[PDB]
Subunit: 116 residues, 3 copies
Amino acid sequence: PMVRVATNLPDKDVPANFEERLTDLLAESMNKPRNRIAIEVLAGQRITHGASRNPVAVIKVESIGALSADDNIRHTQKITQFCQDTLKLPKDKVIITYFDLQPIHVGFNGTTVAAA
Amino acid sequence: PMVRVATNLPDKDVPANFEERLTDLLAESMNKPRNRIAIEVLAGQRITHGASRNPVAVIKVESIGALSADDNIRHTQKITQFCQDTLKLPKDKVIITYFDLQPIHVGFNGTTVAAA
Amino acid sequence: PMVRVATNLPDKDVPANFEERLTDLLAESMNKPRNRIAIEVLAGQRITHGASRNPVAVIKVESIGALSADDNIRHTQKITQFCQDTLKLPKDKVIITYFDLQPIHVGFNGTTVAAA
Ligand SMILES: NS(=O)(=O)c1cc(C(=O)O)c(NCc2ccco2)cc1Cl
Ligand SMILES: NS(=O)(=O)c1cc(C(=O)O)c(NCc2ccco2)cc1Cl
Ligand SMILES: NS(=O)(=O)c1cc(C(=O)O)c(NCc2ccco2)cc1Cl
Ligand SMILES: [Zn+2]
Ligand SMILES: [Zn+2]
Ligand SMILES: [Zn+2]
Ligand SMILES: [Zn+2]
Ligand SMILES: [Zn+2]
Ligand SMILES: [Zn+2]
């Protein structure tokens, strides 16, 4: 899984253990090994929602599978509660997009996943 | 809609009202509510186009629908004109990718849009 | 092609010719014109892989075709080698996602590529 979390909260408000904790959360919920999860964090960024600059996170989650309709309900509930607990965001200021990828469209260790 | 606008123009050159005006523009062009529109702006960034560092914008627009072939002609005309007016970019310096999402792949308010 | 290279390596460590040389690399690999290749470089960013902050690059490659299964093996080999050479990254610290776009989802010069 490859996750990007962007927020307009400052970098000092996104704790240093955020990526590690999010890596544990997605490992368990997506059944993926920790060494196949990458997390990008972009804090202090300009972001609006409804043109408001109130605190918000916009997250992208890519994975090869593990993204059925029902799995995404569960990942959304978990990531949303996690951002509430760690970033203090309201439950309605966490916007997530999922991308279910084929292994032909992922490169790792110098070739595609499909070709590994 | 979840929109990301990246530019090599300095942050001081993307006016504070950019997100507001672009929110209004996309609400009208996509027939989407203002409170379902998020805009990320990333200025001051390293970007090249044909390896040139001349001013350019690279924009991603995600939406659940409202992205037909015909719709996308209208969004591109409107966004490209808006970047020309506000950022002074040439008409051939605004690069846009559209992602038409299913509602099972968007998380908002703690569950998927499909499950809401 | 529209390529995003994010890395936790500092900006001073990503050479000023990085984008020139990647633009040549992608033009030859994908058989796409140099003036249809944009690259975004986001260095100095928070990234973990397996929760490690060791040096890593997370890259997204979007293209109107040229991303067959076999094509993606070649692009992964070349881009991974290229990051080993220029950024001093290990082979297993280069994570790539490919997105194969329809021309109705790409806006350039004020209209879609499909409608050019
Ligand atoms: N190991 S796997 O086939 O389940 C696998 C699964 C995935 C996946 O994203 O599901 C993947 N994504 C790219 C990546 C992220 C971090 C390191 O490589 C790579 C691999 Cl090898
Ligand atoms: N209201 S809606 O069902 O048309 C809707 C539609 C969309 C959409 O993107 O089309 C959407 N994207 C996620 C989001 C962006 C900003 C706040 O939530 C969310 C919702 Cl709830
Ligand atoms: N020339 S083309 O039809 O093969 C073409 C191909 C692509 C493509 O991405 O394959 C494309 N992407 C948008 C873009 C990137 C840089 C400048 O415009 C645009 C065009 Cl016009
Ligand atoms: Zn920091
Ligand atoms: Zn599942
Ligand atoms: Zn600013
Ligand atoms: Zn307004
Ligand atoms: Zn620099
Ligand atoms: Zn060259």
